[PDB]
Ligand SMILES: [N]S(=O)(=O)[C][C][C][C][C]C123[B@@]45[B@]67[B@]89[C@]1%10B81%11B698B746B814B562B%10%1143
């Protein structure tokens with residue numbers, strides 16, 4: 276609708292149009308590493324992206340989405356805390372105006388420079404739109420970004436951003452391999468939560484990887500040249516498109532690792 280990240284339409288305003296913003300399972304959250312309990316019942320995460328077929332990249336005025344063909348069983352997330360099979364539909368990032376902020380989840384109150392979200396829907400609900408209406412409809416794999424060495428697998432994304440500067444622009448983006456965005460380790464934390472953008476639906480199993488990826492300062496600087504505005508509108512840099520941590524309420528965060 277007209278929500279965004281500014282002083283006048285940002286996270287503190289969202290509840291007026293999306294009252295679930297004050298709900299019982301909102302995301303993101305601070306991950307208190309000492310309180311998160313190791314769960315030996317948790318399985319290794321199975322990330323099967325060998326046949327992923329990226330299609331397009333879109334500036335939607337909030338972030339940019341790299342979209343996948345999800346019409347066949349091709350890029351799936353399984354195992355971990357999940358029951359069943361979840362299909363990759365898109366990924367996007369949240370990032371800051373400065374390297375000291377940008378992530379949505381925090382780790383013992385630490386903010387990372389950015390956070391990648393790989394969004395998957397539970398195939399038992401047939402389509403993404405039906406899945407978001409279910410408490411176990413989505414699985415979002417979250418990966419922190421810190422600034423250091425460049426991430427070679429990110430560069431193809433960085434280089435297409437000049438072609439989608441403004442809201443509503445898209446570009447063909449085929450043959451992109453999202454495996455190049457993963458860290459070495461698949462150790463994770465998990466908890467039940469929500470979309471971090473309106474409509475804030477409480478339909479997500481969050482899986483947040485412990486190990487951040489490193490990206491270069493130049494890579495994140497190019498994220499910060501994107502625009503929230505449309506073409507021919509006053510320039511508003513796309514920065515600080517993150518929701519802050521929300522109350523944990525009656526939830527437990529579980530760790531896959533000791
Ligand atoms: N930051 S995050 O929690 O990873 C967003 C997860 C994916 C939301 C996609 C959408 B797409 B359609 B259904 C769900 B609602 B509509 B539009 B609205 B947008 B929101």
Ligand SMILES: [N]S(=O)(=O)[C][C][C][C][C]C123[B@]45[B@]67[B@@]89[C@@]1%10B81%11B698B746B814B562B%10%1143
Nearest residue numbers: 277278279283284288289290291292
């Ligand atoms: N609850 S919500 O969806 O976050 C909407 C909150 C009020 C939106 C009103 C506006 B729209 B954008 B930003 C704020 B300034 B500019 B245009 B102007 B009108 B007023």
Ligand SMILES: [Zn+2]
Nearest residue numbers: 367369392471
């Ligand atoms: Zn997100």
